[PDB]
RNA sequence: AGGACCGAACCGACUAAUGUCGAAAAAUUAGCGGAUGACUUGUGGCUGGGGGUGAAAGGCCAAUCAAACCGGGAGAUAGCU
RNA sequence: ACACAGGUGGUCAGGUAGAGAAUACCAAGGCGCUUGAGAGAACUCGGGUGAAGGAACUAGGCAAAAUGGUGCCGUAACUUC
RNA sequence: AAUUCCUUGUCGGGUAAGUUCCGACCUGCACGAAUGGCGUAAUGAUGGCCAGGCUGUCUCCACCCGAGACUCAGUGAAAU
RNA sequence: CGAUGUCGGCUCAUCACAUCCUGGGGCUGAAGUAGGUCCCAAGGGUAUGGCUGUUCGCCAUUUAAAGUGGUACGCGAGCUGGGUUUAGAACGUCGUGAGACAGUUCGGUCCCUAUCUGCCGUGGGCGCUGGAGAACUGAGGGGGGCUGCUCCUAGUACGAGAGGACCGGAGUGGACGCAUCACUGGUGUUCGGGUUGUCAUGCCAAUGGCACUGCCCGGUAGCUAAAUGCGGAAGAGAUAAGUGCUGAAAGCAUCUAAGCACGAAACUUGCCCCGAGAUGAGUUCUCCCUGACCCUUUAAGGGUCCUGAAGGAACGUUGAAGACGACGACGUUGAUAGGCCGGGUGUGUAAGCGCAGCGAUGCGUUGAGCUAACCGGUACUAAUGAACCGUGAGGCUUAACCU
């Protein structure tokens, strides 16, 4: 019901009993701990403001590591927020592990994807290509028409034109777990999450079901 | 894209950027130190340092291979008789990168790169 | 992977010698087929005395194709070269009794038992 | 293509806001010879970090 | 990666019986036929080994009736039962996709004794 | 023997792309056609404006041609702008 | 019009491979083409390779790909032989 | 038909499907005998069509190698 | 008319509903199946080829369907130039002739470096009012929404029989999008080997340069599709046609005038992304600064000395980040790169020597030698002590609680 932030290590198989070879993803997932537990007339909303990972002494500062102390926590590498799901409180300082990871069957992945750059058009909402020969002369994965005439009179807000790719906070939605092993505390999921081989992603419970 | 790629193009092709390299090795070694842009200094430590890495293995397996690159029997005289012994005790870098000033015809970022034992 | 004006072998004893996907059959503006899915061909060159005579529309199903089919295992089994086995086009059901060569399980499912059984194997 | 008006004076100004230029902020002053050079550079006179390591 | 290096090995097979490309395999593959289970054989002649730890695969083709089949195979995988080597090829290449051009006589290969 | 064949130099210019305020007021790159002939080329002559020359396109006659350029009639004439 | 990827007649013309003045690498001899130092985006220009399919593209097989060398064997319709 | 308007005429062949193409009917809007008629081997950087081969032309584009583009330094235009 | 480039195709769209499909309904000459006709409904989807310059059309074959129109009969400072519609030429034809003919037939230059608007992306300045670091809530905006087939209910409902469901559920595909590199392949001019011609290292040997990487055969990482996962949704709120309940006006009847309830892929959420420049600039947590002097038209003023914090920027090593800035990691208290050691992976028995063979050349040492970006370690080299910017408790008014 609460979701659990982890660094993606990488993708391989797993082979089944029958003989299915079944891509797995293998999320590593530290100790997830709180760090401030909001409440409805304290503090807006509800929620629960989780961290992980291991920084250093002299990296941490000043305004992050006096935010730790009220806590009583270990200083991670940044911190994330989950919306808390109509009634539970853990405190401050609750070390979630993958533990609860082990009954919930399909789960969501949310992490950034890989920046492919400043890419085209045909690179990225799938335009097809013009004739490279028949004539054509310095068009060949060029757009085209991007608006029709004198009376709309303008290009229309939206238009699908090149730009940045990727790059952006992505979710893949519900994935299948296959394992957890609760002693290298890890999470085998079906498919594959963002990429960004080694860098982090929120996994989530189901959303859809 | 070039995501998780190596090397350094230069603005310069295959043929004539492994020409240049193999050339700038020689100029290395023979003055102990030289003067040249960061990115051609950055890009020379990947040619030098696993030619003296061979350099303290005296052979004539290892001769040949010391000779297909850098072409020179000088600079392979120059290596495995003084170079070799030099450095036969510190298994790590054998340069190091210091940045000197700005190329005044161009403004091209200049940087000195010499090896380290430097005693005469 | 057979799309459209692809030269396939035939693997049955039709009277077919070589045939031409002309349309692949189920879906709207689908690319091309896989070893399980039916076709529509024409006969390109035909038996002197044959069944079928060159030039007839008639529905094929693929058996062999040179990209190969993948197996749940990761496995995939390519073959040398294209083929197909005709079949009537109203009440499916193969033309012919003597079918050449090796055909794959992914055919086996109720309606192709009559062209699995027989091939020789697999 | 080609423009159509004449840009003014002070639209020529706000696109060169932009081109201004920052310059030296901070030097630093070397251990030994005390001689002003830019940060990881070596003395004009051949010092870097409190050694002529380069003797000119 | 040893988070991974540590569960690459726990699903590789002890044995597998070292082989080169070139030689004549002998691949026997449990293969589900509905209800049973029964045990049928595949041959041929290795043309590619691609060695990479538990991805570890190998594509064996098959002169049968004419027609070439290929089939890779994956090597820890729970489908494969066994390699059986028959013949021992002295081929130089590593990968042998040349003989996907050739039929018949120039597709033998000579002997490995040494 | 050849207005013969394949094909460099040389001569020409079918096709495509680049170029189009060019590298060039017609070129470059890759192929292409003649390549002992009605061939091609250096030097020097001769034919001139309603005239020349024209394997004839109204093509060419000094980046200009269904009538060259220069100067003079002449500040033509302009019911038009 | 320029320190202009164009035009400009003749002469000499070596080594190896090669039918050769083609072409590839070199000698004598002469140049690195008067802006460069980085980055390694879209897209443009010149190219390299490509799964399965193989003209389904398109006005059109335009462009590319392809064939290509020597000797021997072998060679149709039609013909002015 | 380099000619046929009606017209993609009609029949036969090629194709899964052929306003083009090939062989023929004469119903020649409006062919026709040196402003030549009808054939013709060879030839053609010629027009139309078909088959094999071959492939990025295309299904549907992908990666890579260089010259610009982009950044800093110098010089520095143009149409409007 | 001191210029608004013409048909068609290509690429890329977008809107209307008089709706082709999917959806919900009323009537039937609606048994069922299958249909017909009409109302509401625009969320999404809505061919491939032969022939033709053609739009169109005809034909072949698919599809749940191959919708109808607007947008200079959308779209040439985006491409094409086949048609038409320049100059050459020819046929038929009208004319004495020069020539003419939506009468055909072959050939036939398509320019522009984007100032502004618009749009897709990405930064700077300053603001938000004490300053800084994170985290967010969410106004609002966008993306996405399609569906075939088989099986099950069921040969059940209906029906003499033949035929043969609605509803609901599940499995499995097509087209589309997103993420990804485990696998399947592609590529891999930075890796290993084979090989032709030639030149060179003095020569043999062994390698190197050039010939498009010379031609080639394979192939680490990274990037990707044909590869592999996943998604469209369920539910709820308010309705549209249509169906009602109760119900008078009009003692009856009646869905409607009061009141109330069902009712679609449409509308609002639900799912995903951007998102406090949302100047209405919100909220929470944490850290930082609590020295003295004069002047003054004594005002939220200026200036002096002394201190400049937390933090930021710069500089430098660099990144699965990137056009540039930005953004992420680290800077000796160090693993951010390079080098190095080992491994992995790829190539496939290196060199040298020994033996066999007239010789080329084959075995032995030897699954060797060499191994690009990959994995795990190691301070050997480069990330230098500083300095620069950022201050010294934060205006006025009223309420509210305690001095």
Not at chain 5, 73 to 96: E, N
Request: glycine residues 10%; positive net charge; charged residues 30%.
């Amino acid at each position: 019901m609460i979701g659990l932030v982890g660094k993606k290590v990488g993708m391989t198989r797993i082979f089944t009993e029958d003989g299915v070879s079944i891509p797995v993803t293998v999320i590593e997932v530290e100790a997830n701990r709180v760090t401030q537990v909001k409440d409805l007339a304290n503090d807006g909303y509800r929620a629960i403001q989780v961290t992980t990972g291991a920084k250093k002494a002299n990296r941490v500062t000043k305004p992050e590591a006096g935010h730790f102390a009220k806590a009583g926590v270990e200083a991670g590498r940044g911190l994330w927020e989950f919306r808390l799901a109509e009634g539970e409180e853990f405190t401050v300082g609750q070390s979630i592990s993958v533990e609860l990871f082990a009954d919930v069957k399909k789960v969501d992945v949310t992490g950034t994807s890989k920046g492919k750059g400043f890419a085209g058009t045909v690179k990225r909402w799938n335009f097809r290509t013009q004739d490279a020969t028949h004539g054509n002369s310095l068009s060949h994965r060029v757009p085209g028409s991007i608006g029709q005439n004198q009376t709309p009179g303008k290009v229309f807000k939206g238009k699908k034109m090149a730009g940045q790719m990727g790059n952006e906070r992505v979710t893949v939605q519900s994935l299948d777990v296959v394992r957890v092993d609760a002693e290298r505390n890890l999470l085998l999921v079906k498919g594959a999450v963002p990429g960004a081989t080694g860098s982090d992603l929120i996994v989530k419970p189901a959303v859809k079901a | 894209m070039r995501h998780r790629k190596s090397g350094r193009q230069l603005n310069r092709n295959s043929s004539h950027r492994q020409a240049m390299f193999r050339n700038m090795a020689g100029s290395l070694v023979r003055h102990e130190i030289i003067k040249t842009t960061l990115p051609k200094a950055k890009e020379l430590r990947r040619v030098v340092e696993p030619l003296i890495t061979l350099a303290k293995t005296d052979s004539v397996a290892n001769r040949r291979l010391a000779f297909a690159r850098t072409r020179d029997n000088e600079i392979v005289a120059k290596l495995f008789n003084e170079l070799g012994p030099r450095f036969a005790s510190r298994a790590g870098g054998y340069t190091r990168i210091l940045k000197c000033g700005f190329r005044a015809g161009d403004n091209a970022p200049m940087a000195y790169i010499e090896l380290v034992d430097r005693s005469e | 992977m057979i799309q459209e004006q692809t030269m396939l072998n035939v693997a049955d004893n039709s009277g077919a010698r070589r045939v031409m996907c002309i349309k692949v059959l189920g879906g709207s503006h689908r690319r091309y087929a896989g070893v399980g899915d039916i076709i529509k061909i024409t006969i390109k060159e035909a038996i002197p005395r044959g069944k079928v005579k060159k030039g007839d529309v008639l529905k094929a199903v693929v058996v062999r194709t040179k990209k190969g089919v993948r197996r749940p295992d990761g496995s995939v089994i390519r073959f040398d070269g294209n083929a197909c086995v005709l079949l009537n086009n109203n009440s499916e059901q193969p033309i012919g009794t003597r079918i050449f060569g090796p055909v794959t399980r992914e055919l086996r499912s109720e309606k192709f038992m009559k062209i699995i059984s027989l091939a020789p194997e697999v | 293509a080609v423009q159509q008006n004449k840009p003014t004076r002070s639209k020529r100004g706000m696109r060169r806001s932009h081109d201004a230029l920052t310059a030296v902020t901070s030097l630093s002053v070397d251990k030994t010879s005390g001689e002003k050079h830019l940060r990881h550079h070596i003395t004009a006179d051949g010092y870097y970090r409190g050694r002529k390591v380069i003797a000119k | 990666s040893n988070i991974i290096k540590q569960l690459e090995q726990e699903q590789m097979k002890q044995d597998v019986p070292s082989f080169r490309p070139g030689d004549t395999v002998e691949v026997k593959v449990w293969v589900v036929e509905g209800s049973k289970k029964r045990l049928q054989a595949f041959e041929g002649v290795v043309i590619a080994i691609r060695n990479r730890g538990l991805h570890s695969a190998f594509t064996v083709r098959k002169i049968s009736n004419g027609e070439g089949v290929e089939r890779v195979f994956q090597t820890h995988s729970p489908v494969v039962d066994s390699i059986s080597v028959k013949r021992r090829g002295a081929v130089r290449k590593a990968k042998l996709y040349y003989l996907r051009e050739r039929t018949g006589k120039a597709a033998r290969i000579k002997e490995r004794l040494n």
